[PDB]
Enzyme design. Structure first.
Site, PDB file in Angstrom:
ATOM      1  N   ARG C  62       0.821  -1.201   0.000  1.00 30.60           N
ATOM      2  CA  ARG C  62       0.000   0.000   0.000  1.00 30.60           C
ATOM      3  C   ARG C  62       0.863   1.261   0.000  1.00 30.60           C
ATOM      4  NH1 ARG C  62       1.839  -3.041   4.456  1.00 30.60           N
ATOM      5  NH2 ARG C  62       1.491  -1.930   6.426  1.00 30.60           N
ATOM      6  N   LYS C  64       4.472   2.341  -0.209  1.00 27.31           N
ATOM      7  CA  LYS C  64       5.464   2.566  -1.265  1.00 27.31           C
ATOM      8  C   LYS C  64       6.147   3.916  -1.048  1.00 27.31           C
ATOM      9  CE  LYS C  64       2.198   3.540  -5.172  1.00 27.31           C
ATOM     10  NZ  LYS C  64       0.953   3.298  -4.391  1.00 27.31           N
ATOM     11  N   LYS C 273     -51.025   5.698 -14.963  1.00 28.93           N
ATOM     12  CA  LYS C 273     -51.291   7.064 -15.391  1.00 28.93           C
ATOM     13  C   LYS C 273     -51.255   7.956 -14.162  1.00 28.93           C
ATOM     14  CE  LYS C 273     -54.461  10.085 -17.897  1.00 28.93           C
ATOM     15  NZ  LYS C 273     -55.810  10.258 -18.493  1.00 28.93           N
ATOM     16  N   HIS C 274     -50.833   9.218 -14.376  1.00 25.96           N
ATOM     17  CA  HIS C 274     -50.661  10.273 -13.372  1.00 25.96           C
ATOM     18  C   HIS C 274     -50.274   9.672 -12.029  1.00 25.96           C
ATOM     19  CE1 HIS C 274     -54.977   9.084 -13.188  1.00 25.96           C
ATOM     20  NE2 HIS C 274     -54.802   9.233 -11.888  1.00 25.96           N
ATOM     21  N   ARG C 440     -61.308   7.047   5.146  1.00 27.69           N
ATOM     22  CA  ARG C 440     -61.443   5.761   4.462  1.00 27.69           C
ATOM     23  C   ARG C 440     -62.879   5.535   3.991  1.00 27.69           C
ATOM     24  NH1 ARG C 440     -59.194   0.356   4.936  1.00 27.69           N
ATOM     25  NH2 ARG C 440     -59.865   1.665   3.191  1.00 27.69           N
ATOM     26  N   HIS C 538     -47.635   5.051   0.258  1.00 25.33           N
ATOM     27  CA  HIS C 538     -47.700   6.396  -0.296  1.00 25.33           C
ATOM     28  C   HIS C 538     -46.676   6.548  -1.414  1.00 25.33           C
ATOM     29  CE1 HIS C 538     -50.604   7.283   2.574  1.00 25.33           C
ATOM     30  NE2 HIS C 538     -49.920   8.008   3.451  1.00 25.33           N
TER      31      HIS C 538
END
Lengths: 538, 94, 538, 94
Positions: C62, C64, C273-274, C440, C538
RNA sequence: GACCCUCUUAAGGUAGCGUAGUACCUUGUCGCUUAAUUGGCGACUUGCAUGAAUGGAUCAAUGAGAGCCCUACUGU
RNA sequence: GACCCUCUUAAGGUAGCGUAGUACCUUGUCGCUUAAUUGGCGACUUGCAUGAAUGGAUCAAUGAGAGCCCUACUGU
């Protein structure tokens, strides 16, 4: 303990004092270049790197230095023999503190072409190395990268005597991080200038695990950003209230964005459920606005995120009593109010944001598309050109009546017939939504009247004036303004709008038959301006 | 038009007369009260912002000389305005 | 030309060949440490770094070297005085080719506690320097961090003669980037292990300027993550098609998710879609599949985009003909279909993904909540337990129906009432959703039931069987399976569903009054199995 | 149970008999057709997957000996199944 | 040497490729290859007179096809 | 030395702080400060007998308050 210190700081900010301190604590200062100069011109004796390495000097101010074979002395233990001995060799020194910061890279643009040559030229090669080397020393050498931590260091030394492991750790990590940033810059710039493929690194540091996720086995973990920006969840205090979760943060931010589109001035509030700001209001004294949004949505509501534009007061605090809210955001609070809510309730995630009534500080968003990260330029620009073509035009006040859509239909889910209309003396709140469903018209098809009149309903029901329901609604429905999304598809849909007595739709202009959109608006009598700013919020 | 609002000078406000004494919380409270009291206040007789505090609870209009009793640090209070609006609503009703 | 080669590649792949190639053209090989041996054994003559930079080397593997005015030689401009100067000095070499990769950083928890010591003591310091130095040379010297492009380089050299600017550029950019990667790791790990913060360092390469965003001027780029797991919009095959906008990309995500959420299975698609579930059903061929997911949607439809698991052909492209579609996501694609779509309606953005159907490959997802970003795990959890608290349990047929919904509803924006009902025994289809409606019960009011019956209508009339509408519905009116987010609020609402006959509802575990809800569905006998999954997507 | 599907071996399939000849597109087409034809096919007489191609368009069941005419590379075609289902719908109707 | 006009007696070369098996000028200019190369390869290209099934570009494998270079070998 | 039980004759020390102006043992152990320090500061802390308005921790500024150290200064 610190015995020798290598102060090769590009940014010299406050090095003079750190140096003075060290010298007073004996610490020999082995520095070169700019630093060395300042220090010897400020009455601090400093030895030069020449009396360490066997490397003279050249272009002092960035590289000129390095340390082979030898860096392995400070390395990860400047006392670990095998480690130690390497840095000190022949006249070299066993420096146990190195402070090397790196001037931030910048390309800019010159009068005659990008100054690539010199600009790139100044990529510090010595510095970064010294940093990484010292840094690795989780022990011994105490690396001082960031200039705004000379105090802490000094104090610790002056007292204790040895920079504690904890500290050493923090410092080292921070250094590595600094070099990381450096390289990242070196990437982004070059990838945008030299070649074309551009690279966007992100700013997500200091982490915190939350509760879980959408489900109990869906662990989410907020990662704050180091950026000083401005109004952001990162800088908000949970006075009281159980730890906010995924949904919490999400909606809270959406709310913040909603209230921040209206930019100071007029008092305003907001609310939101399942990523849907379903209750913006402006008005005067919050009180009304607040409750007006609660009228806007008297169903779902219970457990939303109130996002007022200033401090909350007892008046509406007593109105909030019983009407469950998930989080209440606010720039600041009043002691008695705060206390009141705190003790009475047992769930309100009170998260007022210290000083949010200023500049947001961001202009880009990063929608994660499973291997994609876009960078939409944050813009809320109400209109590009106010050009009502239809024979029926909008007077300045009816103009505001329309503008309020843009104001909120942007800062909330679209595909919503946003009916921003009068409700408080010269202050217009959004009355009806659209709840973003299939076809554009589908919005009015099961909204517009749906909400507008549910609200009207509650209002009327309560105060039961002589004006029976029909003409009651009519009172404002005849004057309603709907600036729904961008350019509303066709003409019989707008007819449905006029149907609900709202002779005031608003359409940016240029759908399936713009000429017919005009024709119909003339016939019907629907006054509509051709704003041109599609508010959806992408 | 105002003072040299330095990079750090926008916190103490009128509580800069207290120096490092009395704590940030009470300094902020006093500064906010001073700002609210020194804000312009519209005269209910001439409709122009010339109402200044002449004493503890006494307010006077510099233009028309209209002098009245109001709040200690604010010419008009929320309770008084609520009472006024209640009686105005009654008067409109009848 | 390029006559010197300092190749200390940590990773010893390709170096053998590269080195020979070089030796052949000449190019003295001045490597050391590992490389040295491997080459001087394979045959390739190699000179040790020892006789270049003034003083030798240390701890091979590593470290050197790390010599200032030797790295400054290679650095940049090895032929421009000031700069070149550091490639000559005292035997100091003017090396022109460098390739030194960095073995990635790792922590390797040891049996006896995390090997933090070793880990830190194996962060290459030498490498990054040499590298970033060479890299700096947009001109002269050439650096090749990445081992997986030795060919390209060799090729050019062999043929042309000298390396090319274009190449040098890329090479450098890449090298810097690589050092960045290294640093990043060094920060992340050590910031979690040593300290306890979670720095999230992200990088999105392959930056592609697109259309816009919300505004017509909201410039944003589809920065392509370089992740090579599997299903990725980035690595797509747009047969023909204008640059798809943010919108398209997102909805792409949506459909890709849903389709793969169903674990593909018997010919399935996912019309979208969307960014709201606009189609989901199974089949035995895409014929049925396609129409089994288009069926339930008579509204939104036109403007959607297909995301399939098998093949889209002209057979079903007949009904498709006209039915406005923005994008195609076909793993396999038929030539004639392709051609027809091509001319027919330009809109067809044919964005097939090369055998898209695999395992996602990533384990995280993000939502830039402007001021931070969350890290939501890639969860695919489809159910906890399969057991109806209500005595009357699901027959395998309706268990399959529930199992069905689970997938869609979990991959469906929630706060809704997902009413997927059988179109073809075994091959299910969606019949209801409910894009985030207040409560809901309000959702089941303006969605589920309504859309179900309107669908049933569309179906019945369209295909005109003997059985008259009323009884055609009757047959499966109860059978209709609806999991819907999680626990349906109370019992009276479930009974409203039973009012629309619907005696098959799925209810995870933990409703607002489970005790009662159970009692109710048990008396009614409504098959109400308790999956347990708080999907609430979500 | 199958061959040594190496890290790279899963592309040629039965078209590995062609080597580097004829192009990836036609090699893929031929390999897919071979896979579809060699897939198991259920016998309409005994309801078990023993139908194999005996010639160009001739298919035979190894169990019950039921031999019939079908597609060239597939025992049952979409057009034939559509015709069968149309006649079955008529027969159910009457 | 881009851009409004032209000359436009239908239109005025898109993607590409380019001194080419097409380039007269011509042994075109530069770089590698040689001590030295009307050569080969790469780039540039003002294309006498390239260009999309008069099919354009490109290409793994194959080739008693056509050039250039290295190594080994040798009475060439 | 965590953890089920206890002894629990109401309960059994949370956040913090800790040899303290509270620590008997005691000049407790280690590091800086000194040539050498029953000292000061920092950490550890088995707390004889710390701990939340018997208010806990902490603290800029202020102090003829109480200790220790450096510099300058000197007949101390």
């Amino acid at each position: 303990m610190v015995k020798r210190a290598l102060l090769s700081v590009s940014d010299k900010t406050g090095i003079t004092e750190f140096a003075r301190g060290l010298e007073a604590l004996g610490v020999k200062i082995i520095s070169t270049g700019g630093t060395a100069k300042i220090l010897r011109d400020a009455g601090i004796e400093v030895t030069d790197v020449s009396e360490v390495t066997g490397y003279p000097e050249m272009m002092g101010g960035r590289v000129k230095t390095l340390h082979p074979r030898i860096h392995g002395g400070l390395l990860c233990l400047r006392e670990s023999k095998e480690q130690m001995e390497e840095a000190e060799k022949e006249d070299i020194s066993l420096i146990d503190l190195v402070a090397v910061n790196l001037y931030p890279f910048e390309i800019t643009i010159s009068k005659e072409g990008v100054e690539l040559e010199e600009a790139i030229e100044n990529i510090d090669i010595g510095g970064p190395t010294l940093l990484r080397s010292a840094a690795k020393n989780y022990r011994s050498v105490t690396v001082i990268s960031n200039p705004s931590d000379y105090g802490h260091v000094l104090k610790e030394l002056r007292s204790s005597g040895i920079i504690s492991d904890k500290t050493r750790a923090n410092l080292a990590v921070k250094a590595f991080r600094h070099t990381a940033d450096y390289d990242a810059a070196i990437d982004t710039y070059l990838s945008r200038t030299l070649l074309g493929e551009e690279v966007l690194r992100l700013k997500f540091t200091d982490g915190v695990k939350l509760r879980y996720g959408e489900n109990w086995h869906q662990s989410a973990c907020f990662y704050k950003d180091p950026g000083i920006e401005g109004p952001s969840l990162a800088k908000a205090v949970q006075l009281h209230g159980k730890e906010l979760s995924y949904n919490n943060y999400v909606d809270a931010d959406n709310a913040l964005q909603t209230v921040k589109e209206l930019g100071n001035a007029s008092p305003a509030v907001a609310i939101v459920k399942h990523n849907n700001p379903c209750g913006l209001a402006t008005g005067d004294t919050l009180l009304q606005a607040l409750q007006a949004a609660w009228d806007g949505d008297p169903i779902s509501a219970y457990g939303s995120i109130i996002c007022t534009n200033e401090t909350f007061d007892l008046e509406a605090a007593t109105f909030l009593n019983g009407k469950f809210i998930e989080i209440i955001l606010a720039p600041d609070f009043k002691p008695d109010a705060l206390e009141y809510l705190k003790n009475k309730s047992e769930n309100l995630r009170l998260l007022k944001l210290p000083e949010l009534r200023e500049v947001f500080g961001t202009e880009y968003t990063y929608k994660y598309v499973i291997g994609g990260m876009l960078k939409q330029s944050r813009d809320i620009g109400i209109y590009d050109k106010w050009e009502s073509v239809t024979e029926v035009s909008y007077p300045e006040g009816k103009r505001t009546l329309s503008e309020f859509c843009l104001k909120a239909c942007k800062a909330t889910k679209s595909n919503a017939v946003i009916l921003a209309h009068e409700y408080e003396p010269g202050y217009f709140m959004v009355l009806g939504m659209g709840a973003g469903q299939p076809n554009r018209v589908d919005s009015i098809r099961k909204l517009a009247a749906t909400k507008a009149v549910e609200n009207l309903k509650v209002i009327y029901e309560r105060e039961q004036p002589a004006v029976a329901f029909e003409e009651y609604c009519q009172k404002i429905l005849s004057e309603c303004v709907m600036a729904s999304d961008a350019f509303f598809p066709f003409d019989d849909s707008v007819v449905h709008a006029a149907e609900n007595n709202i002779r005031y739709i608003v359409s940016p202009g240029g759908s399936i038959r713009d000429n017919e959109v005009i024709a119909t608006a003339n016939r019907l009598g629907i006054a509509m301006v051709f704003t041109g700013m599609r508010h959806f919020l992408h | 038009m105002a003072k040299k609002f330095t990079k750090k000078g926008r916190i103490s406000r009128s509580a800069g007369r207290f120096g490092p004494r009395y704590g940030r919380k009470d300094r902020k409270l006093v500064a906010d009260l001073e700002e609210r009291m020194r804000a312009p206040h519209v005269c209910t007789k001439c409709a122009r912002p010339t109402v200044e505090r002449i004493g503890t609870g006494i307010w006077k209009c510099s233009k028309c000389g209209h002098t009245f009793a109001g709040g200690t640090y604010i010419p008009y209070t929320s309770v008084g305005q609520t009472l006024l609006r209640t009686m105005k609503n009654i008067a409109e009703a009848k």
